[model samples]
Target chain A: TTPGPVMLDVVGTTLSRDDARRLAHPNTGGVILFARHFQNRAQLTALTDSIRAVREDILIAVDHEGGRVQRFRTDGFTVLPAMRRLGELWDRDVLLATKVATAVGYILAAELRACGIDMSFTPVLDLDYGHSKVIGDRAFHRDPRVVTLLAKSLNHGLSLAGMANCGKHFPGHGFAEAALPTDDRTLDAILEQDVAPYDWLGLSLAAVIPAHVIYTQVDKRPAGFSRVWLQDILRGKLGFTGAIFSDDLSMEAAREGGTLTQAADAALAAGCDMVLVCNQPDAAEVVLNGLKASAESVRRIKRMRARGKALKWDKLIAQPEYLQAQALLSSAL
Target chain B: TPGPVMLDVVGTTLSRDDARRLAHPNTGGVILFARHFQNRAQLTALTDSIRAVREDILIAVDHEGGRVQRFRTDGFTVLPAMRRLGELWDRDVLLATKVATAVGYILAAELRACGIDMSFTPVLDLDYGHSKVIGDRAFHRDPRVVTLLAKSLNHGLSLAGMANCGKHFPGHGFALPTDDRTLDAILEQDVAPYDWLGLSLAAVIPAHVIYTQVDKRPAGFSRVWLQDILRGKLGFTGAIFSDDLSMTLTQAADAALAAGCDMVLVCNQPDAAEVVLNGLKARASAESVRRIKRMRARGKALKWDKLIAQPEYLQAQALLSSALA
Candidate 1:
């Protein structure tokens, strides 16, 4: 009726004979790649091609946001500045900053499109709290409104490049004062203030990745496995219609959800469409066996699969529009 | 004969016409461009080309060795992450932090050789207290060792590029508790520490940037001048250069010696330079002139004429190996 589940990883890039066997399992359905997997443009194209050979329906993805997070550099990749620079410019000169943001977005998405990548997890909506050591140069600004405006501009650029977008760590990670080795207090704070801007902007983001942070005040579990956060709060209250992807379950904070099987079950029970179990294949199998595809799970998987048809990596990469976008992006920087 | 003076606007690129006139004058020094002036590569090339028009001029710059200072991104040049990376690499691996220091030295020297006149750099000292802003980015954990190591690294870099190095605000700017607008007292604690390091340092910068609230005397104006205190007391006996006079903290605290400092510094705002020169020209009581002259005499007779002709430009440009390709 609905079909099985949709899990993905970089196809030929990461899937060895063992990995391929794992992917062949009914639960797996997509693949993602990083720069390390890419030896060159040709190798990447071949890898994607081989991935399609295994399962025609398998989705491919990458984290291709420019600036500090850019993965595929060299060979026609546009060099983007840190997002904070745009905020700084906006403070001094609003007009120039808007143009720069649009340019950065277009450049980023276009480069990804040209490289046969489907979506980029980008436009970090975290308001620059100035206290965050990790996200300092990553966030657009301290003001929520500015963050919204900048993210929207970047989204428009991604749309132009024929690429979908994933707004990350759902609530926000910018307000984290300090990353504790064990505590998750910072994560809870993010769930409150960080989610506000996304609500205000009314962005129809393609997908949302819930943070692996637990808010003891709101829920004992991380948002990725908290029904109040993903189902009730994000979907019902915030009206985010898109698929919900959990932040890397491989992270230590998310590990508290029990074994990989229990973690996957918790995320699904909490309302996540897909649980991303990265790097650890052993754990992924455990999660795959724990969850059987129910009619509702199948229906959700079908809905996500329907969205996949819209993305034709080869066609998108070869388009004149994509080439022009890349050229224009390079010239701007 | 010294060179003409230049002024930095509050924000904006250089005034080329003003720069041209200043370059042709007895004053031939210019500060490096800041972020506001930078834009894509072409604009940067244009900025450098314009400055190079007047051959053999001194283009002083502040490319400090830590995160507290750096210019990077699209319009400007991106420098390597500073000293912290060195410290981090040292702890994790078998490689020495000296490699990191050498990289910093080469980066600065090479930048200078690349049509840049000279860099005011290799902040040769240690970061002493808690200021998150300047802590990890400083060269080393210890002051005594940092001074010797920095000197060695700087000497290698300078020899490679033949660039002039300015050892910063002699007492070091690291002790300031916060970079906030308030002035903190100089503990008067670094004298013996600085002397122990041995001073082959070319230009000895004085911290005369004041803490009037702590000591009525501003280091810039105090008989505590680096020459008397740094040279006489600590026996540095090198060129006494002042930090930015435009900084409100330095200007406000050292207001009393405004004329005295103006007379001593090689570079000053045109107006401030004129005022100090006039004060010296006027029969500044004989004692004042003697004090001013004492500073002037201690300065090495820098051969601006021959140095300009020999122009370290090509040599300096060659040192920046990272930028070449």
Candidate 2:
């Protein structure tokens, strides 16, 4: 079965018959797991397995960038530091910071994979401008050079665990402080600094999640729904050929694009390989029922699926790389 | 009287060759380095002799604060690095602006007293804390802070009858020729000061960085950056300067002028200077000449002896001492 363009969510820790019906939708490409979906390692593993049982090709992902955003903290999920901590470490010792970044990525990925989760949107590329409350501490540093290198280091760590990384809030959201922040800066300014990391990261960057904020200077629509940002800039200028994911349309920022169906349609039309409709199953159902699928999108979605064999929790705990990685994080962070 | 080339002399005194180079038709200005300054008397004599070659030559120096000042000894008031002003800004905005103005006044008054025309006093680059070349030279990481501080500093230079040139445009704090960043990102942060500073900015020097996503050529050589963005869009009527010709990875007079720089500098290499002078064919427009000539010191500058006696100078120095100490 072809993976669709819509990434929806489950109702609870266990998949219901209704959840299976939604997952079986021809338009359902992936499922995003939340903190509400995790009870313990056994339950989380069973939940992912149950979802996969419904549709083998569906991608399972989470916003697990360690500090604060980590969906699963208990049950042996090595509490990871925020992206800013890595940047702080970088200011003092760059070499050790990079090594530690790779360790964090390996541990984050290995643990998620152990629970049968396919991907985690780690390594945020936003510059920490101190203006955005939403992006505070999640961002690395004010300097684009530091953000690019640190995010690259984190991505390298992700790659080591046989998992790919996705750099979020494309261009950047750190400059805007509003709930649905609108960045009024020029296109050159956004491209030169905020978007530099994407270009610098090169092939190491597997996917990108553009911000929900509107860049008033370029387009009134959110970056996630702007063809100017997604197609012209990202694909044409920067030559990013990876999957483009729409940030959760359930957020207030996405409401500007219209109803959930219209927002999903716009995101897909704007070059998003997958549009995520989280926390609202009825809305997700509406999008799944209304949306159309493309082979090109399916190809991009399929590539995002987990690579290599994942170790079960029992085997993963016994591994030396995992134990060593855990120790490195414990000492530094 | 004004042309697009700015060349330098080799010694404290102008040589026959140096005089001849200064007399070249393309030589619009002479940039003074420490080698040309044994003392105030020596520096003044050198500037006068250079003027004897051409009366309206625009004399300039990279006498920005901290590590980049050309003349540190012999009455040059070792000015504070731009970062200190920014640190002061975080504590007290009003006091920081006053000190910025005082620093600018002292810098221009002293330079003009020695018969020098202008000093590229205020650097508009935001201190991203990444580029070693641009480190403390930039005012602040925030563009708004940089704008207010630079504007206040420019106001001080204006009081001393010296025009200011804000440099390494769009901004060099990010650092690179292989910069593959989009034009938007460059404009949003680094270019914000340029947009905010507006007419307070008298001239600009584009970076040698090649924003490959925006243009294949570096910003200094790219007509898109110098012409379209700086002049057309930003509505800047001031002079456009190219960072020293050699650091341009070597583009001589015509390309730089054609790319929209009003004047180009050739320093440290007299042979390269001659090549640029001898090979140059592009003529400056009337508007370009007017802008270049406007860079010359505006009012009669008091001699070194008279400058030190002024209460304003003494007070500024005292304020500077209080800040620096």
Candidate 3:
């Protein structure tokens, strides 16, 4: 019942040997591949195969939302237009937006499933605040309700593909202008109003990934490392019993809480079912060895593992049904 | 002399049939292609073709800057990333920005010489302000200095290419939000600062495209339009060009006096031009034609035949080897 250990990075695909070794580790539960890890279908299949061989239960995740966020491309993938295109489509026709959003969701999930990956952290819930640069092309639109409707359609498409989806940077990460290149001082003033959409959508989420940003008004620790956020706010206040995963603790912003080991300890102690230490294997090793799981942590880990069992990668890849479903959802666009 | 006749958007390239027909009638010049016309080699051929077809010499133009503006692509052209990259490159490496700005100038001039009638405009000056959309894409961080530097760059680029350049929207348009879906009412507060930037860059441009959204004044018809604002306030006294008159935004905003603006921009339909010309004739009588004649006079100064005689086109195609003085 111990909390699972996971490592992630901004990579596209991984080699079988590395994938197997990482998944086979005693507490290893998953690997999050970033844009750099992908090459094409065959390489991705081999990578997923190696991980499955080491541990059949291990999860594979990627952030492959179409538009500006799409990772898989070249020979076959749709050069999906930006999310703003969907937003533009929505302005022109609501039904079209829904249909297109669903198609995009299906396209994204089906494409990843075809490559043998299990899940994708997607359908960013950040309401488009027009002033933010990083979230410019990422958010579905400026309205929270539109984001919810479009996100629900997208998640519906993912579910149709039989892929479990993770709603990310949970509360929201769209308010900042651009993260200061070096400083992490920007999240101090995030207004509480932004959390309303997250609360509304929290129950539908299979898993939630917290932001690396600190909401100092609510918690002293960054949301990724704060128990006040993980346990009290997300679990207790909002009733999101879903598995909680930390944003990569290797980022400069997350490096504030002592060393990597200390960051892992704080995240786990805060009630994260799994901590994602990405890129830096040496630091990941420090966190994995130093942490110990508690009884509640074990129970939470079991609940998350239960959700993982429902994931059907093969079914997600086998059909084109999600594409039709998505088309239905985005008919307005 | 008559001003340039409106060009027609045919398929991707522009057709000079209307220009040819109107040469003796009223047309003096033509704007070039955006989608259909392209690159150095093909465009040179296309320009030559356009010239051969027209009896009266006419000017051709395109908006070919990188990022928000772009036309040439593939081997004959290097796609310059937007202005944000300049700032980003500045942060990573200082020397790269200067080299990039110079490259930007060379890219514009090179295309200009290749047979572009004119480089329609360089958004020479805008303060980034609150718009998330405009943020890093504007050249230089400051407005006053950006005006100075952009003017200098335009001078170098235009001189290098023998291409005349136009300055945009006498007042800036960057204050609008990034999302085009939302209608942003201009904060009248923005006008004074825009006046300053407009005035500074005015001397360098041959004509100024007026975007009236800045001051509830439809840059086209406000007495403030060509007179009080451009001539009186900024001391522009230059040729005034209107924004696309057919656009829904412009039509919706200034329905009342749409006809009075000198040189109404009717991009697509030849009929819309006929309607505006007839409307101007009905409304202003003799005065409107005279004003149109005066605007057409400004184009004579550009002298396409004389400019074509010089080696400015050839010199601009090669990289500039001079240091900034």
Best by TM-score: 2
Ordered by lDDT, highest first, the candidates read 2, 1, 3
User: lDDT tens digits, residues B158-197, model 1?
Assistant: 3223233444444454442212222222323233234433
State every prediction's TM-score relative to the real structure. Answer: 0.46, 0.51, 0.45
The whole-model lDDT of each prediction reads: 0.51, 0.81, 0.50
lDDT of 2: 0.81
Residue-wise C-alpha lDDT for candidate 1, range A1-333, written one tens digit per residue: 122344545434534676666666777756657677787666776676676666665656676665677778876566677788778877875534554565576567655655555567776776787766656677888886667556655654554344456777666766555422222454345545677656643322456777665555567777788888787787877656566777777776576736766777778878887777776666676666766535544433333322212224555455433454454445434
Candidate 2 C-alpha lDDT tens digits along B1-325: 7778898888898898888888788889988887788898889889999898898789999989898898988988898899999999898665676678778889989998999989976798888788887889888999878876786677667656678898888878776446666889988888877765544567888888888788888888899998889887766777888888865223456788888988988888887898888888788998788678767776467798988986457767877888657
lDDT tens per residue, model 3, B1-325: 4432344434333356443344434334455555545554566666556556654444445443454444555333443433643454345322232333344445554454555444554454344554454344455545433443343343333222323334444434453212121213321322332343221122222112334343344445556545555455544423344544554433421332332333434556655554443333223234334433322111112233433333322322332232211
Specify the CAPRI tier of model 3.
incorrect
Name model 3 segments beyond 4 Å from true: A1-3, A9-19, A178-192, A294-333, B1-325
Clash counts for all predictions: 18, 18, 33
Candidate 1 scores a chain A TM-score of 0.83
Provide the TM-score, chain A, model 2.
Answer: 0.98
